[PDB]
Amino acid sequence: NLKIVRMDRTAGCVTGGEEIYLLCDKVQKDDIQIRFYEEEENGGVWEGFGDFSPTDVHRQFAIVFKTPKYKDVNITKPASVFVQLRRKSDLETSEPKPFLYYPEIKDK
Amino acid sequence: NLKIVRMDRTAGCVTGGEEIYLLCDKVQKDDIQIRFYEEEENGGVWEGFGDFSPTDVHRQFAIVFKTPKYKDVNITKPASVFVQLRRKSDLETSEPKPFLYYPEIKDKEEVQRKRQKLMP
Amino acid sequence: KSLFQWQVEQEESKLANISQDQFLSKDADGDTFLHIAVAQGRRALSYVLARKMNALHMLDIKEHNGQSAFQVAVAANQHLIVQDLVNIGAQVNTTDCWGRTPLHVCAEKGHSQVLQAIQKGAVGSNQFVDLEATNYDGLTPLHCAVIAHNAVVHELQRNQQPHSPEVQELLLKNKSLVDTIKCLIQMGAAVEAKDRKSGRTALHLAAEEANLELIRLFLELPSCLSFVNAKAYNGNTALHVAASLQYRLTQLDAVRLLMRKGADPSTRNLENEQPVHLVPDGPVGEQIRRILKGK
Numbered sequence: 001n002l003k004i005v006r007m008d009r010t011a012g013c014v015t016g017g018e019e020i021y022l023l024c025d026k027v028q029k030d031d032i033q034i035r036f037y038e039e040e041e042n043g044g045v046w047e048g049f050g051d052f053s054p055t056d057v058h059r060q061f062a063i064v065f066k067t068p069k070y071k072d073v074n075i076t077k078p079a080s081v082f083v084q085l086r087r088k089s090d091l092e093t094s095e096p097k098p099f100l101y102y103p104e105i106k107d108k
Numbered sequence: 109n110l111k112i113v114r115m116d117r118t119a120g121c122v123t124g125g126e127e128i129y130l131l132c133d134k135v136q137k138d139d140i141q142i143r144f145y146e147e148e149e150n151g152g153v154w155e156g157f158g159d160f161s162p163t164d165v166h167r168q169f170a171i172v173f174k175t176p177k178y179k180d181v182n183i184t185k186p187a188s189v190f191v192q193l194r195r196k197s198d199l200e201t202s203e204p205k206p207f208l209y210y211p212e213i214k215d216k217e218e219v220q221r222k223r224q225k226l227m228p
Numbered sequence: 229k230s231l232f233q234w235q236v237e238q239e240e241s242k243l244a245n246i247s248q249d250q251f252l253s254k255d256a257d258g259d260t261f262l263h264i265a266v267a268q269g270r271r272a273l274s275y276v277l278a279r280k281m282n283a284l285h286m287l288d289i290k291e292h293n294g295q296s297a298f299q300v301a302v303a304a305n306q307h308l309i310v311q312d313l314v315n316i317g318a319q320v321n322t323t324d325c326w327g328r329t330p331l332h333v334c335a336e337k338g339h340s341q342v343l344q345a346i347q348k349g350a351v352g353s354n355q356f357v358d359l360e361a362t363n364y365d366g367l368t369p370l371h372c373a374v375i376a377h378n379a380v381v382h383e384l385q386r387n388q389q390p391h392s393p394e395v396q397e398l399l400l401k402n403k404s405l406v407d408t409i410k411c412l413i414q415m416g417a418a419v420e421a422k423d424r425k426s427g428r429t430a431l432h433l434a435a436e437e438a439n440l441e442l443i444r445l446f447l448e449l450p451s452c453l454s455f456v457n458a459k460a461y462n463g464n465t466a467l468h469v470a471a472s473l474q475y476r477l478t479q480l481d482a483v484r485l486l487m488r489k490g491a492d493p494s495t496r497n498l499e500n501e502q503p504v505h506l507v508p509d510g511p512v513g514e515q516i517r518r519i520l521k522g523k
């Protein structure tokens with residue numbers, strides 16, 4: 001299975017691009033994704049992916065990545081989403097952790 | 109051999125107690141220290157140690173720890189120090205990484221700034 | 229007729245004048261008159277300016293820091309003014325620009341009277357106080373209070389001088405933070421709430437510092453046996469943490485206290501380790517080992 005053991009950040013600005021350190025159970029650097037998602041009553045989810053190269057996977061037990069941009073960069077209230085590890089080869093996922101996207105401060 | 113691969117913070121408040129994720133080459137959880145240090149003019153050395161328990165060492169390849177208090181919490185300008193891994197058993201050290209201690213920002217809510225304001 | 233009733237009716241006698249363009253206007257910092265009055269502790273003036281801003285539904289105007297006048301009063305520790313503001317409907321469930329709720333600010337600073345003010349004001353304004361709100365660090369207000377108290381305790385067991393302006397300040401903050409924690413719990417805060425970063429409970433957080441006063445406080449709660457063996461994301465319990473610590477003068481007593489109040493020494497973390505497997509080498513770990521095995 002997959003498991004997120006610790007994350008140094010569980011909130012981020014909707015603009016994305018912010019660096020996060022994630023500690024995990026053993027993964028393989030070319031078979032791992034970090035999936036952000038948000039399930040509305042809808043039929044097809046919103047999703048975004050953590051930005052990192054395989055070299056950012058540290059000794060199979062940690063990943064340093066940048067947050068994806070949230071779907072709406074113009075929100076005025078924080079949006080609660082989820083983050084999970086996903087394996088590319090068999091699409092298995094870790095249990096989801098809550099992640100908070102907060103509004104951008106667009107002045108100066 | 110010891111090595112700090114990367115750290116999620118390269119600066120922190122002089123007050124210490126701030127959580128840092130450090131990625132390292134392989135260590136043993138009971139035999140590792142994180143040492144902040146600063147050479148001083150009289151030839152002495154200030155040192156402070158990252159605060160963590162062995163369980164905060166993640167699978168021998170990462171350490172989550174709290175920064176030590178800097179030697180002087182009353183500085184008005186940031187102070188640069190070095191941070192290194194150190195093995196307790198043989199006192200081998202990693203190459204150092206830069207770390208910046210900055211002054212405590214009192215009253216960030218700007219309460220006192222408003223008390224000084226004037227009204228009709 | 230109490231004095232406050234006099235100065236209030238007296239206040240409105242002096243500023244039934246201002247009016248409506250001058251106190252709704254914002255400073256370069258975004259501060260209105262109420263923000264400043266609140267910060268200065270002008271209870272009578274704050275009451276009047278608030279009532280006039282409230283009628284226009286402009287009570288919760290935020291400055292450049294994302295702080296309403298109510299949020300400013302919280303930070304300023306003006307619990308009298310706080311209660312006045314929340315009573316007339318000031319939004320309790322809000323954040324500043326750093327993502328902190330008024331409860332979080334109370335928790336960090338140990339403003340228990342402010343916290344009690346919020347509780348009363350919310351009752352008299354039909355407001356729901358979200359005790360489990362998380363800040364940008366994934367922490368509930370209880371979490372913040374515990375971490376703040378750990379820092380105080382850790383320092384008290386380190387500074388060598390009573391007469392210091394800081395230590396007497398630390399001593400009072402030691403008391404105020406515990407009072408704040410008690411208030412939060414009395415208000416219904418979940419001790420078993422987990423930090424979003426690591427899955428630590430308030431008990432876990434206390435155990436990290438071998439914080440005897442807080443460990444004792446939490447373990448006395450009715451739900452003690454329901455969270456004493458709670459596991460963080462890495463599978464560790466508070467007993468795992470206590471047994472493994474860098475030497476503190478209160479480490480042994482923390483382990484004893486956890487054992488005595490029902491912590492399970494056979495619990496295993498993700499790496500199948502029990503607390504006994506985590507003890508430091510040498511005599512100290514041996515002493516901890518006996519406590520874990522002994523009755």
Ligand SMILES: CCCC[C@H](O)[C@H](O)CO
Nearest residue numbers: 145146147187188189190
């Ligand atoms: C501000 C003093 C800098 C200290 C410096 O980082 C270490 O002594 C390097 O030897």
